[PDB]
Design a protein around this motif. Structure first.
Motif, PDB file in Angstrom:
ATOM      1  N   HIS A   1      -7.531  -3.542   1.383  1.00  7.58           N
ATOM      2  CA  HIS A   1      -6.654  -4.540   1.883  1.00  7.58           C
ATOM      3  C   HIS A   1      -7.091  -5.011   3.202  1.00  7.58           C
ATOM      4  O   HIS A   1      -6.753  -4.513   4.214  1.00  7.58           O
ATOM      5  CB  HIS A   1      -5.103  -4.123   2.107  1.00  7.58           C
ATOM      6  N   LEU A   2      -7.848  -6.222   3.370  1.00 11.49           N
ATOM      7  CA  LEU A   2      -8.352  -6.833   4.558  1.00 11.49           C
ATOM      8  C   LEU A   2      -7.232  -7.510   5.235  1.00 11.49           C
ATOM      9  O   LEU A   2      -6.145  -7.989   5.032  1.00 11.49           O
ATOM     10  CB  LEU A   2      -9.364  -7.862   4.294  1.00 11.49           C
ATOM     11  N   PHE A   3      -7.349  -7.202   6.863  1.00 13.20           N
ATOM     12  CA  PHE A   3      -6.493  -7.822   7.827  1.00 13.20           C
ATOM     13  C   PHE A   3      -7.017  -8.700   8.419  1.00 13.20           C
ATOM     14  O   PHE A   3      -7.917  -8.844   9.133  1.00 13.20           O
ATOM     15  CB  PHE A   3      -6.167  -6.517   8.522  1.00 13.20           C
TER      16      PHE A   3
ATOM     17  N   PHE B   1      -5.373  -1.225   7.628  1.00 18.32           N
ATOM     18  CA  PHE B   1      -4.372  -1.804   7.169  1.00 18.32           C
ATOM     19  C   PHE B   1      -4.062  -1.370   5.803  1.00 18.32           C
ATOM     20  O   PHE B   1      -2.715  -1.843   5.229  1.00 18.32           O
ATOM     21  CB  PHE B   1      -4.687  -3.318   7.315  1.00 18.32           C
TER      22      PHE B   1
ATOM     23  N   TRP C   1      -2.931   1.279   5.079  1.00 16.90           N
ATOM     24  CA  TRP C   1      -1.663   2.056   5.512  1.00 16.90           C
ATOM     25  C   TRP C   1      -0.345   1.215   5.275  1.00 16.90           C
ATOM     26  O   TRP C   1       0.749   1.569   4.805  1.00 16.90           O
ATOM     27  CB  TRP C   1      -1.693   2.428   6.979  1.00 16.90           C
ATOM     28  N   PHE C   2      -0.410  -0.017   5.193  1.00 15.70           N
ATOM     29  CA  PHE C   2       0.786  -0.758   5.243  1.00 15.70           C
ATOM     30  C   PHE C   2       1.263  -0.920   3.901  1.00 15.70           C
ATOM     31  O   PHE C   2       2.594  -1.113   3.691  1.00 15.70           O
ATOM     32  CB  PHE C   2       0.330  -2.342   5.528  1.00 15.70           C
ATOM     33  N   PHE C   3       0.477  -0.663   2.864  1.00 15.42           N
ATOM     34  CA  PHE C   3       0.881  -0.566   1.259  1.00 15.42           C
ATOM     35  C   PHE C   3       1.005   0.780   1.095  1.00 15.42           C
ATOM     36  O   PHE C   3       0.164   1.265   1.024  1.00 15.42           O
ATOM     37  CB  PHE C   3      -0.239  -1.607   0.624  1.00 15.42           C
ATOM     38  N   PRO C   4       2.183   1.046   0.808  1.00 17.44           N
ATOM     39  CA  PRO C   4       2.565   2.653   0.361  1.00 17.44           C
ATOM     40  C   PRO C   4       1.585   2.760  -0.942  1.00 17.44           C
ATOM     41  O   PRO C   4       1.400   3.841  -1.112  1.00 17.44           O
ATOM     42  CB  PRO C   4       3.973   2.606  -0.055  1.00 17.44           C
ATOM     43  N   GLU C   5       1.384   1.870  -1.599  1.00 17.88           N
ATOM     44  CA  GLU C   5       0.432   2.274  -2.846  1.00 17.88           C
ATOM     45  C   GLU C   5      -0.738   2.644  -2.417  1.00 17.88           C
ATOM     46  O   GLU C   5      -1.183   3.469  -3.496  1.00 17.88           O
ATOM     47  CB  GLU C   5       0.160   0.783  -3.668  1.00 17.88           C
TER      48      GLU C   5
ATOM     49  N   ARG D   1      -0.407   6.517  -2.070  1.00 13.76           N
ATOM     50  CA  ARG D   1       0.243   6.996  -3.303  1.00 13.76           C
ATOM     51  C   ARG D   1      -0.797   7.133  -4.221  1.00 13.76           C
ATOM     52  O   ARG D   1      -0.830   8.537  -4.768  1.00 13.76           O
ATOM     53  CB  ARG D   1       1.266   5.914  -3.851  1.00 13.76           C
ATOM     54  N   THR D   2      -1.830   6.151  -4.176  1.00 15.05           N
ATOM     55  CA  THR D   2      -2.708   6.269  -5.346  1.00 15.05           C
ATOM     56  C   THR D   2      -3.736   7.411  -4.897  1.00 15.05           C
ATOM     57  O   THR D   2      -4.145   8.223  -5.816  1.00 15.05           O
ATOM     58  CB  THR D   2      -3.601   4.872  -5.277  1.00 15.05           C
TER      59      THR D   2
ATOM     60  N   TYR E   1       2.846  -0.024  14.389  1.00 17.15           N
ATOM     61  CA  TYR E   1       3.580   0.418  13.623  1.00 17.15           C
ATOM     62  C   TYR E   1       3.120   1.512  12.933  1.00 17.15           C
ATOM     63  O   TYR E   1       3.951   2.715  12.634  1.00 17.15           O
ATOM     64  CB  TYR E   1       3.851  -0.489  12.451  1.00 17.15           C
TER      65      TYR E   1
ATOM     66  N   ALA F   1       4.571   4.900  10.851  1.00 13.30           N
ATOM     67  CA  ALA F   1       4.673   5.195   9.551  1.00 13.30           C
ATOM     68  C   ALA F   1       3.749   6.293   8.949  1.00 13.30           C
ATOM     69  O   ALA F   1       4.056   6.819   7.709  1.00 13.30           O
ATOM     70  CB  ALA F   1       4.218   4.058   9.093  1.00 13.30           C
TER      71      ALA F   1
ATOM     72  N   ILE G   1       5.611   9.186   7.485  1.00  9.81           N
ATOM     73  CA  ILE G   1       6.302   8.788   6.337  1.00  9.81           C
ATOM     74  C   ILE G   1       5.316   8.888   5.114  1.00  9.81           C
ATOM     75  O   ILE G   1       5.662   9.291   3.970  1.00  9.81           O
ATOM     76  CB  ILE G   1       7.118   7.532   6.588  1.00  9.81           C
ATOM     77  N   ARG G   2       4.182   8.267   5.291  1.00  8.45           N
ATOM     78  CA  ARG G   2       3.088   8.266   4.221  1.00  8.45           C
ATOM     79  C   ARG G   2       2.712   9.878   3.797  1.00  8.45           C
ATOM     80  O   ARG G   2       2.843  10.194   2.729  1.00  8.45           O
ATOM     81  CB  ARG G   2       1.911   7.667   4.703  1.00  8.45           C
TER      82      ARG G   2
END
Ligand SMILES: [Mg+2]
Ligand SMILES: [Mg+2]
Lengths: 261, 261
Positions: A114-116, A146, A148-152, A155-156, A175, A179, A182-183
Protein backbone atom coordinates in the motif's frame (compact mmCIF):
# COMPACT_ATOMS: atom_id res chain seq x y z
CA UNK A 1 13.42 -13.55 22.67
CA UNK A 2 14.73 -9.98 22.42
CA UNK A 3 13.72 -7.71 19.58
CA UNK A 4 14.75 -4.18 18.63
CA UNK A 5 14.11 -1.12 16.50
CA UNK A 6 16.76 1.18 15.10
CA UNK A 7 15.36 4.67 14.80
CA UNK A 8 17.74 6.62 12.52
CA UNK A 9 17.81 9.70 10.30
CA UNK A 10 18.58 8.63 6.72
CA UNK A 11 20.52 11.24 4.72
CA UNK A 12 18.76 11.54 1.38
CA UNK A 13 20.79 10.10 -1.55
CA UNK A 14 23.73 9.21 0.76
CA UNK A 15 23.64 5.44 1.06
CA UNK A 16 27.23 5.08 2.27
CA UNK A 17 26.60 7.46 5.21
CA UNK A 18 23.35 5.60 5.92
CA UNK A 19 25.16 2.24 5.94
CA UNK A 20 27.67 3.65 8.43
CA UNK A 21 24.88 4.89 10.64
CA UNK A 22 22.89 1.67 10.40
CA UNK A 23 25.94 -0.45 11.27
CA UNK A 24 26.63 1.60 14.38
CA UNK A 25 23.05 1.30 15.67
CA UNK A 26 22.59 -2.35 14.75
CA UNK A 27 25.78 -3.14 16.68
CA UNK A 28 24.32 -1.26 19.67
CA UNK A 29 21.08 -3.28 19.46
CA UNK A 30 23.16 -6.49 19.27
CA UNK A 31 25.12 -5.52 22.40
CA UNK A 32 21.81 -5.03 24.19
CA UNK A 33 21.01 -8.63 23.28
CA UNK A 34 18.59 -8.16 20.39
CA UNK A 35 18.16 -11.14 18.09
CA UNK A 36 15.92 -9.35 15.58
CA UNK A 37 16.65 -5.74 14.58
CA UNK A 38 14.27 -3.68 12.46
CA UNK A 39 15.36 -0.56 10.53
CA UNK A 40 13.18 2.19 8.96
CA UNK A 41 11.58 2.32 5.55
CA UNK A 42 14.01 3.44 2.82
CA UNK A 43 16.92 3.66 5.30
CA UNK A 44 19.50 3.66 2.49
CA UNK A 45 18.10 6.25 0.08
CA UNK A 46 15.84 8.50 2.19
CA UNK A 47 12.30 9.33 1.15
CA UNK A 48 11.40 12.85 0.01
CA UNK A 49 12.43 12.68 -3.66
CA UNK A 50 11.78 15.40 -6.17
CA UNK A 51 12.08 13.06 -9.13
CA UNK A 52 12.03 9.32 -9.57
CA UNK A 53 15.37 9.72 -11.35
CA UNK A 54 17.39 10.70 -8.33
CA UNK A 55 16.30 7.50 -6.45
CA UNK A 56 16.38 5.20 -9.50
CA UNK A 57 20.04 6.28 -10.04
CA UNK A 58 21.20 4.87 -6.71
CA UNK A 59 18.65 2.11 -5.91
CA UNK A 60 20.04 -1.37 -5.38
CA UNK A 61 18.91 -4.79 -6.59
CA UNK A 62 17.88 -7.42 -4.04
CA UNK A 63 19.77 -9.54 -3.11
CA UNK A 64 22.74 -8.76 -5.42
CA UNK A 65 23.10 -5.06 -4.65
CA UNK A 66 24.98 -3.06 -2.06
CA UNK A 67 22.31 -2.64 0.59
CA UNK A 68 21.66 -6.37 0.87
CA UNK A 69 25.36 -7.28 0.80
CA UNK A 70 26.10 -4.60 3.41
CA UNK A 71 23.39 -5.86 5.74
CA UNK A 72 24.56 -9.47 5.19
CA UNK A 73 28.02 -8.47 6.50
CA UNK A 74 26.50 -6.74 9.52
CA UNK A 75 24.20 -9.70 10.33
CA UNK A 76 27.12 -12.09 10.10
CA UNK A 77 29.37 -9.94 12.28
CA UNK A 78 26.75 -9.28 14.99
CA UNK A 79 24.77 -12.54 14.73
CA UNK A 80 21.37 -10.86 14.44
CA UNK A 81 18.51 -11.04 11.95
CA UNK A 82 17.77 -7.70 10.26
CA UNK A 83 14.63 -6.42 8.56
CA UNK A 84 15.38 -3.14 6.79
CA UNK A 85 13.56 -0.88 4.34
CA UNK A 86 15.36 -0.25 1.05
CA UNK A 87 14.65 1.11 -2.42
CA UNK A 88 14.68 -1.98 -4.60
CA UNK A 89 15.69 -1.77 -8.24
CA UNK A 90 14.25 -4.57 -10.35
CA UNK A 91 15.05 -3.86 -13.99
CA UNK A 92 13.26 -0.66 -14.98
CA UNK A 93 11.03 -0.58 -11.90
CA UNK A 94 11.48 0.43 -8.30
CA UNK A 95 9.79 -1.17 -5.34
CA UNK A 96 9.59 0.18 -1.78
CA UNK A 97 10.95 -2.93 -0.13
CA UNK A 98 12.20 -4.56 3.01
CA UNK A 99 15.05 -7.04 3.08
CA UNK A 100 15.37 -9.85 5.61
CA UNK A 101 18.91 -11.15 6.28
CA UNK A 102 20.38 -13.31 8.99
CA UNK A 103 23.85 -14.52 9.98
CA UNK A 104 23.94 -17.06 7.12
CA UNK A 105 22.84 -14.57 4.48
CA UNK A 106 19.81 -13.39 2.55
CA UNK A 107 16.46 -14.74 3.71
CA UNK A 108 13.85 -12.93 1.65
CA UNK A 109 12.09 -9.70 0.83
CA UNK A 110 8.75 -7.95 1.03
CA UNK A 111 7.44 -5.23 -1.35
CA UNK A 112 5.20 -2.53 0.13
CA UNK A 113 1.64 -3.33 -0.89
CA UNK A 114 0.00 0.00 0.00
CA UNK A 115 1.95 3.01 -1.32
CA UNK A 116 1.54 6.37 0.42
CA UNK A 117 1.12 9.75 -1.29
CA UNK A 118 4.01 10.58 -3.66
CA UNK A 119 5.49 7.06 -3.35
CA UNK A 120 2.96 6.30 -6.12
CA UNK A 121 5.07 8.44 -8.47
CA UNK A 122 8.30 6.50 -7.77
CA UNK A 123 7.47 2.95 -6.83
CA UNK A 124 5.41 0.12 -8.21
CA UNK A 125 2.85 -1.35 -5.78
CA UNK A 126 4.18 -4.54 -4.20
CA UNK A 127 3.40 -7.84 -5.82
CA UNK A 128 4.72 -10.55 -3.46
CA UNK A 129 1.90 -10.49 -0.95
CA UNK A 130 2.40 -10.46 2.81
CA UNK A 131 5.11 -12.93 3.80
CA UNK A 132 6.13 -14.59 7.02
CA UNK A 133 9.75 -15.77 7.37
CA UNK A 134 10.54 -18.67 9.69
CA UNK A 135 13.74 -18.11 11.60
CA UNK A 136 13.26 -21.27 13.75
CA UNK A 137 13.32 -19.47 17.05
CA UNK A 138 10.58 -17.13 15.74
CA UNK A 139 8.46 -16.35 12.68
CA UNK A 140 8.68 -12.79 11.53
CA UNK A 141 6.05 -11.10 9.37
CA UNK A 142 7.00 -7.89 7.52
CA UNK A 143 4.89 -4.90 6.51
CA UNK A 144 6.08 -1.38 5.67
CA UNK A 145 4.95 2.12 6.81
CA UNK A 146 1.38 2.91 5.54
CA UNK A 147 0.63 -0.82 5.43
CA UNK A 148 -0.25 -0.27 9.11
CA UNK A 149 -3.29 1.77 8.07
CA UNK A 150 -5.00 -1.28 6.57
CA UNK A 151 -5.91 -3.76 9.32
CA UNK A 152 -5.77 -6.48 6.64
CA UNK A 153 -1.93 -6.18 6.42
CA UNK A 154 -1.24 -7.17 10.03
CA UNK A 155 -4.14 -9.66 9.99
CA UNK A 156 -2.67 -11.45 6.94
CA UNK A 157 0.77 -11.73 8.56
CA UNK A 158 -0.75 -12.97 11.86
CA UNK A 159 -2.88 -15.59 10.07
CA UNK A 160 0.27 -16.85 8.40
CA UNK A 161 1.86 -17.45 11.82
CA UNK A 162 3.87 -14.32 12.55
CA UNK A 163 5.11 -14.12 16.15
CA UNK A 164 6.29 -10.58 15.53
CA UNK A 165 5.50 -8.08 12.79
CA UNK A 166 8.63 -6.22 11.78
CA UNK A 167 7.46 -2.79 10.53
CA UNK A 168 9.97 -0.42 8.86
CA UNK A 169 8.23 2.97 8.71
CA UNK A 170 8.74 6.62 7.62
CA UNK A 171 5.73 8.09 9.38
CA UNK A 172 4.43 11.58 8.62
CA UNK A 173 1.05 11.36 10.42
CA UNK A 174 0.74 11.03 14.19
CA UNK A 175 -1.65 8.08 14.24
CA UNK A 176 0.48 4.94 13.98
CA UNK A 177 1.95 5.03 17.52
CA UNK A 178 -1.65 4.96 18.83
CA UNK A 179 -2.70 2.31 16.37
CA UNK A 180 0.15 -0.20 16.63
CA UNK A 181 -0.84 -1.44 20.12
CA UNK A 182 -4.31 -2.17 18.68
CA UNK A 183 -2.80 -4.04 15.69
CA UNK A 184 -0.79 -6.07 18.22
CA UNK A 185 -3.85 -6.70 20.42
CA UNK A 186 -6.30 -7.65 17.62
CA UNK A 187 -3.88 -10.29 16.23
CA UNK A 188 -2.29 -11.32 19.51
CA UNK A 189 1.20 -10.55 18.15
CA UNK A 190 4.17 -8.33 18.97
CA UNK A 191 4.89 -5.43 16.65
CA UNK A 192 8.19 -3.58 16.15
CA UNK A 193 7.81 -0.30 14.33
CA UNK A 194 11.17 1.19 13.38
CA UNK A 195 10.43 4.74 12.31
CA UNK A 196 12.86 7.32 10.97
CA UNK A 197 13.39 10.79 12.35
CA UNK A 198 14.53 14.04 10.77
CA UNK A 199 13.51 16.82 8.49
CA UNK A 200 14.15 16.09 4.85
CA UNK A 201 13.60 18.78 2.23
CA UNK A 202 10.86 20.36 4.37
CA UNK A 203 9.15 17.15 5.44
CA UNK A 204 9.34 16.25 9.10
CA UNK A 205 9.07 12.59 10.19
CA UNK A 206 7.34 11.49 13.38
CA UNK A 207 9.91 9.29 15.06
CA UNK A 208 8.18 7.49 17.97
CA UNK A 209 9.34 4.00 17.03
CA UNK A 210 7.71 1.50 19.36
CA UNK A 211 7.44 -2.14 20.33
CA UNK A 212 3.92 -3.26 21.30
CA UNK A 213 2.73 -6.36 23.10
CA UNK A 214 -0.28 -8.63 22.44
CA UNK A 215 -1.83 -6.88 25.49
CA UNK A 216 -1.59 -3.48 23.72
CA UNK A 217 1.21 -2.49 26.13
CA UNK A 218 4.00 -0.25 24.82
CA UNK A 219 7.18 -2.09 25.82
CA UNK A 220 9.56 0.49 24.32
CA UNK A 221 8.98 3.83 22.65
CA UNK A 222 11.38 6.33 21.15
CA UNK A 223 11.65 10.07 20.97
CA UNK A 224 10.27 12.16 18.13
CA UNK A 225 13.62 13.46 16.92
CA UNK A 226 16.63 11.42 18.19
CA UNK A 227 18.43 8.44 16.75
CA UNK A 228 18.12 5.55 19.15
CA UNK A 229 17.75 1.85 19.64
CA UNK A 230 14.93 0.28 21.61
CA UNK A 231 14.92 -3.32 22.79
CA UNK A 232 12.23 -5.43 24.46
CA UNK A 233 11.99 -8.99 25.65
CA UNK A 234 9.00 -10.84 24.21
CA UNK A 235 7.17 -14.05 25.21
CA UNK A 236 6.37 -16.20 22.24
CA UNK A 237 3.96 -18.55 24.05
CA UNK A 238 1.70 -15.51 24.53
CA UNK A 239 1.39 -14.95 20.78
CA UNK A 240 1.21 -18.54 19.62
CA UNK A 241 -1.77 -19.35 21.84
CA UNK A 242 -4.56 -17.32 20.26
CA UNK A 243 -6.86 -17.76 23.28
CA UNK A 244 -7.74 -14.45 24.92
CA UNK A 245 -9.69 -16.37 27.53
CA UNK A 246 -10.75 -19.98 27.88
CA UNK A 247 -13.80 -19.64 25.60
CA UNK A 248 -12.40 -17.37 22.82
CA UNK A 249 -9.53 -18.16 20.42
CA UNK A 250 -9.32 -15.19 18.17
CA UNK A 251 -8.48 -17.10 14.96
CA UNK A 252 -10.96 -19.91 15.60
CA UNK A 253 -13.60 -17.20 16.24
CA UNK A 254 -13.15 -15.47 12.89
CA UNK A 255 -16.04 -16.17 10.53
CA UNK A 256 -14.54 -15.16 7.22
CA UNK A 257 -17.60 -15.75 5.08
CA UNK A 258 -19.21 -12.64 6.65
CA UNK A 259 -16.28 -10.35 5.94
CA UNK A 260 -16.38 -7.67 3.25
CA UNK A 261 -19.84 -8.64 1.89
CA UNK B 1 -26.54 15.80 12.01
CA UNK B 2 -26.31 14.76 15.68
CA UNK B 3 -25.81 11.17 16.89
CA UNK B 4 -25.81 9.91 20.47
CA UNK B 5 -25.16 7.06 22.85
CA UNK B 6 -27.30 6.16 25.88
CA UNK B 7 -25.15 4.72 28.68
CA UNK B 8 -27.42 2.93 31.13
CA UNK B 9 -27.41 0.21 33.79
CA UNK B 10 -29.68 -2.61 32.72
CA UNK B 11 -31.26 -4.48 35.65
CA UNK B 12 -30.88 -8.17 34.89
CA UNK B 13 -34.13 -9.96 34.11
CA UNK B 14 -36.22 -6.76 34.60
CA UNK B 15 -37.18 -5.51 31.11
CA UNK B 16 -39.98 -3.25 32.52
CA UNK B 17 -37.44 -1.25 34.52
CA UNK B 18 -35.03 -1.20 31.58
CA UNK B 19 -37.69 0.19 29.24
CA UNK B 20 -38.50 2.92 31.73
CA UNK B 21 -34.84 3.88 32.10
CA UNK B 22 -34.14 3.70 28.36
CA UNK B 23 -37.11 5.91 27.55
CA UNK B 24 -35.93 8.56 30.01
CA UNK B 25 -32.45 8.64 28.51
CA UNK B 26 -33.57 8.46 24.86
CA UNK B 27 -35.72 11.53 25.53
CA UNK B 28 -32.70 13.31 27.01
CA UNK B 29 -30.65 12.60 23.86
CA UNK B 30 -33.56 13.71 21.66
CA UNK B 31 -33.91 16.94 23.71
CA UNK B 32 -30.25 17.67 22.87
CA UNK B 33 -30.98 17.27 19.13
CA UNK B 34 -29.85 13.72 18.48
CA UNK B 35 -31.28 12.09 15.36
CA UNK B 36 -29.70 8.66 15.93
CA UNK B 37 -29.58 7.17 19.43
CA UNK B 38 -27.63 3.97 20.24
CA UNK B 39 -28.37 1.88 23.38
CA UNK B 40 -26.14 -0.86 24.95
CA UNK B 41 -26.00 -4.55 24.16
CA UNK B 42 -28.80 -6.51 25.80
CA UNK B 43 -30.32 -3.39 27.31
CA UNK B 44 -33.66 -5.13 28.01
CA UNK B 45 -32.49 -8.34 29.66
CA UNK B 46 -29.07 -7.58 31.13
CA UNK B 47 -26.09 -9.82 30.42
CA UNK B 48 -24.56 -11.96 33.14
CA UNK B 49 -26.76 -15.07 32.92
CA UNK B 50 -26.20 -18.33 34.66
CA UNK B 51 -28.79 -20.39 32.79
CA UNK B 52 -30.11 -20.17 29.30
CA UNK B 53 -33.59 -20.64 30.83
CA UNK B 54 -33.69 -17.41 32.84
CA UNK B 55 -33.03 -15.41 29.61
CA UNK B 56 -35.03 -17.58 27.25
CA UNK B 57 -38.14 -17.15 29.36
CA UNK B 58 -38.14 -13.35 28.94
CA UNK B 59 -36.45 -12.83 25.52
CA UNK B 60 -38.63 -11.09 22.97
CA UNK B 61 -39.26 -11.91 19.27
CA UNK B 62 -38.28 -9.38 16.59
CA UNK B 63 -40.18 -7.50 15.34
CA UNK B 64 -43.45 -8.43 16.99
CA UNK B 65 -42.18 -8.69 20.60
CA UNK B 66 -42.19 -6.17 23.42
CA UNK B 67 -38.73 -4.68 23.06
CA UNK B 68 -39.25 -3.80 19.40
CA UNK B 69 -42.75 -2.46 20.28
CA UNK B 70 -41.34 -0.32 23.02
CA UNK B 71 -38.57 1.01 20.81
CA UNK B 72 -41.00 1.84 17.98
CA UNK B 73 -43.17 3.78 20.42
CA UNK B 74 -40.29 5.88 21.75
CA UNK B 75 -38.86 6.45 18.24
CA UNK B 76 -42.26 7.76 17.07
CA UNK B 77 -42.82 9.92 20.13
CA UNK B 78 -39.39 11.54 20.33
CA UNK B 79 -38.66 11.58 16.58
CA UNK B 80 -35.33 9.69 16.54
CA UNK B 81 -33.88 6.56 15.00
CA UNK B 82 -32.74 4.01 17.56
CA UNK B 83 -30.28 1.11 17.51
CA UNK B 84 -30.55 -1.04 20.63
CA UNK B 85 -29.18 -4.35 21.85
CA UNK B 86 -31.80 -6.96 22.73
CA UNK B 87 -32.01 -10.71 23.38
CA UNK B 88 -33.81 -12.07 20.33
CA UNK B 89 -36.02 -15.14 20.59
CA UNK B 90 -36.40 -17.08 17.34
CA UNK B 91 -38.17 -20.40 17.94
CA UNK B 92 -36.07 -22.36 20.47
CA UNK B 93 -33.00 -20.29 19.66
CA UNK B 94 -31.71 -16.96 21.08
CA UNK B 95 -29.54 -14.45 19.21
CA UNK B 96 -27.65 -11.55 20.75
CA UNK B 97 -29.18 -8.91 18.52
CA UNK B 98 -29.70 -5.23 17.78
CA UNK B 99 -32.93 -3.69 16.57
CA UNK B 100 -33.05 -0.64 14.35
CA UNK B 101 -36.22 1.46 14.36
CA UNK B 102 -37.17 4.89 13.20
CA UNK B 103 -40.13 7.20 13.76
CA UNK B 104 -42.15 5.40 11.08
CA UNK B 105 -41.49 1.85 12.25
CA UNK B 106 -39.18 -1.16 12.40
CA UNK B 107 -36.24 -0.95 10.02
CA UNK B 108 -34.18 -4.11 10.64
CA UNK B 109 -32.00 -6.19 12.86
CA UNK B 110 -28.42 -7.40 13.22
CA UNK B 111 -27.32 -10.60 15.02
CA UNK B 112 -23.90 -10.55 16.76
CA UNK B 113 -21.40 -12.37 14.57
CA UNK B 114 -18.65 -12.85 17.14
CA UNK B 115 -19.99 -14.12 20.49
CA UNK B 116 -17.96 -13.28 23.56
CA UNK B 117 -17.07 -15.60 26.44
CA UNK B 118 -20.14 -17.08 28.21
CA UNK B 119 -22.52 -15.69 25.53
CA UNK B 120 -21.57 -18.89 23.74
CA UNK B 121 -23.56 -20.87 26.37
CA UNK B 122 -26.77 -18.87 25.69
CA UNK B 123 -26.85 -17.48 22.17
CA UNK B 124 -26.49 -18.78 18.65
CA UNK B 125 -23.85 -17.05 16.47
CA UNK B 126 -25.43 -14.47 14.20
CA UNK B 127 -26.22 -15.36 10.62
CA UNK B 128 -27.12 -12.17 8.74
CA UNK B 129 -23.65 -10.68 8.29
CA UNK B 130 -22.90 -7.01 8.88
CA UNK B 131 -25.80 -4.92 7.67
CA UNK B 132 -25.95 -1.25 6.76
CA UNK B 133 -29.36 0.43 7.02
CA UNK B 134 -30.12 3.27 4.62
CA UNK B 135 -32.15 5.96 6.42
CA UNK B 136 -32.02 8.14 3.27
CA UNK B 137 -30.33 11.03 5.08
CA UNK B 138 -27.52 8.77 6.32
CA UNK B 139 -26.49 5.10 6.33
CA UNK B 140 -26.04 3.34 9.67
CA UNK B 141 -23.97 0.19 10.13
CA UNK B 142 -24.49 -1.96 13.24
CA UNK B 143 -22.08 -4.19 15.14
CA UNK B 144 -22.26 -5.40 18.73
CA UNK B 145 -19.76 -5.45 21.61
CA UNK B 146 -16.89 -7.91 20.95
CA UNK B 147 -17.41 -7.43 17.15
CA UNK B 148 -15.11 -4.43 17.75
CA UNK B 149 -12.21 -6.79 18.39
CA UNK B 150 -12.19 -8.08 14.83
CA UNK B 151 -11.25 -5.25 12.45
CA UNK B 152 -13.22 -7.05 9.76
CA UNK B 153 -16.55 -6.13 11.39
CA UNK B 154 -16.18 -2.39 11.12
CA UNK B 155 -14.46 -2.68 7.74
CA UNK B 156 -17.40 -4.67 6.32
CA UNK B 157 -19.85 -1.99 7.45
CA UNK B 158 -17.71 0.88 6.19
CA UNK B 159 -17.27 -0.80 2.74
CA UNK B 160 -21.03 -0.90 2.50
CA UNK B 161 -21.22 2.84 2.92
CA UNK B 162 -21.92 3.29 6.60
CA UNK B 163 -21.68 6.94 7.62
CA UNK B 164 -21.85 5.88 11.27
CA UNK B 165 -21.32 2.54 12.93
CA UNK B 166 -23.80 2.12 15.76
CA UNK B 167 -22.17 -0.10 18.39
CA UNK B 168 -24.24 -1.44 21.36
CA UNK B 169 -21.69 -2.82 23.84
CA UNK B 170 -21.39 -4.40 27.30
CA UNK B 171 -17.61 -4.02 27.73
CA UNK B 172 -15.72 -5.88 30.40
CA UNK B 173 -12.16 -5.42 29.09
CA UNK B 174 -10.43 -2.06 29.10
CA UNK B 175 -9.37 -2.03 25.43
CA UNK B 176 -12.32 -0.95 23.31
CA UNK B 177 -12.26 2.75 24.24
CA UNK B 178 -8.66 2.94 22.99
CA UNK B 179 -9.43 0.85 19.86
CA UNK B 180 -12.63 2.55 18.65
CA UNK B 181 -10.91 5.72 17.45
CA UNK B 182 -8.58 3.49 15.38
CA UNK B 183 -11.62 1.62 13.92
CA UNK B 184 -13.12 5.05 13.04
CA UNK B 185 -9.82 6.25 11.50
CA UNK B 186 -8.94 3.16 9.49
CA UNK B 187 -12.40 3.19 7.87
CA UNK B 188 -12.85 6.98 7.82
CA UNK B 189 -16.21 6.53 9.60
CA UNK B 190 -17.89 7.77 12.76
CA UNK B 191 -18.45 5.24 15.56
CA UNK B 192 -20.92 5.45 18.43
CA UNK B 193 -20.23 2.92 21.16
CA UNK B 194 -23.06 2.81 23.71
CA UNK B 195 -21.71 0.81 26.63
CA UNK B 196 -23.51 -0.14 29.83
CA UNK B 197 -22.35 0.54 33.33
CA UNK B 198 -22.96 -1.27 36.60
CA UNK B 199 -22.15 -4.38 38.55
CA UNK B 200 -24.21 -7.48 37.75
CA UNK B 201 -23.68 -10.65 39.80
CA UNK B 202 -20.19 -9.34 40.60
CA UNK B 203 -19.22 -8.50 36.99
CA UNK B 204 -18.25 -4.85 36.54
CA UNK B 205 -18.83 -3.17 33.18
CA UNK B 206 -16.46 -0.52 31.87
CA UNK B 207 -18.83 2.34 30.98
CA UNK B 208 -16.73 4.75 28.80
CA UNK B 209 -19.28 4.99 25.97
CA UNK B 210 -17.78 7.11 23.22
CA UNK B 211 -18.23 8.74 19.88
CA UNK B 212 -15.16 8.60 17.63
CA UNK B 213 -14.52 10.57 14.44
CA UNK B 214 -12.87 9.59 11.08
CA UNK B 215 -9.82 11.53 12.37
CA UNK B 216 -9.55 9.34 15.50
CA UNK B 217 -10.85 12.19 17.62
CA UNK B 218 -13.05 11.34 20.60
CA UNK B 219 -16.02 13.69 20.34
CA UNK B 220 -17.77 12.46 23.48
CA UNK B 221 -16.79 9.98 26.21
CA UNK B 222 -18.85 8.85 29.17
CA UNK B 223 -17.96 8.06 32.80
CA UNK B 224 -17.01 4.61 34.04
CA UNK B 225 -20.01 4.23 36.37
CA UNK B 226 -22.85 6.71 35.70
CA UNK B 227 -25.91 6.58 33.46
CA UNK B 228 -25.74 9.37 30.89
CA UNK B 229 -26.19 10.38 27.31
CA UNK B 230 -23.63 11.82 24.92
CA UNK B 231 -24.57 13.72 21.79
CA UNK B 232 -22.29 15.12 19.07
CA UNK B 233 -22.60 16.58 15.56
CA UNK B 234 -21.05 14.58 12.73
CA UNK B 235 -19.73 15.75 9.33
CA UNK B 236 -21.06 13.44 6.63
CA UNK B 237 -18.63 14.68 3.99
CA UNK B 238 -15.68 13.68 6.19
CA UNK B 239 -16.87 10.02 6.12
CA UNK B 240 -18.13 9.94 2.53
CA UNK B 241 -14.86 11.24 1.04
CA UNK B 242 -12.42 8.37 1.49
CA UNK B 243 -9.45 10.46 0.32
CA UNK B 244 -7.03 11.09 3.16
CA UNK B 245 -4.87 13.10 0.74
CA UNK B 246 -4.86 13.85 -3.01
CA UNK B 247 -3.21 10.53 -3.80
CA UNK B 248 -4.79 8.06 -1.33
CA UNK B 249 -8.43 7.05 -1.33
CA UNK B 250 -8.51 4.44 1.36
CA UNK B 251 -11.02 2.15 -0.34
CA UNK B 252 -9.49 2.42 -3.82
CA UNK B 253 -6.16 1.62 -2.17
CA UNK B 254 -7.27 -1.74 -0.70
CA UNK B 255 -5.82 -4.69 -2.58
CA UNK B 256 -7.98 -7.63 -1.48
CA UNK B 257 -6.04 -10.03 -3.74
CA UNK B 258 -3.22 -9.93 -1.18
CA UNK B 259 -5.41 -10.23 1.94
CA UNK B 260 -5.87 -13.36 4.00
CA UNK B 261 -3.73 -15.44 1.60
MG1 LIG C 1 8.01 16.23 -1.01
MG1 LIG D 1 -39.83 -14.89 14.61
Amino acid sequence: VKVAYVQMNPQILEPDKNYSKAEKLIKEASKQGAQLVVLPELFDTGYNFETREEVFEIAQKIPEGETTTFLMDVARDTGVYIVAGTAEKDGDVLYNSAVVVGPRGFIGKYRKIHLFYREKFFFEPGDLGFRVFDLGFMKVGVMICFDWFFPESARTLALKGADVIAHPANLVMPYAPRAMPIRALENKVYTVTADRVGEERGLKFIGKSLIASPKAEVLSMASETEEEVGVAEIDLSLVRNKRINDLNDIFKDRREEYYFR
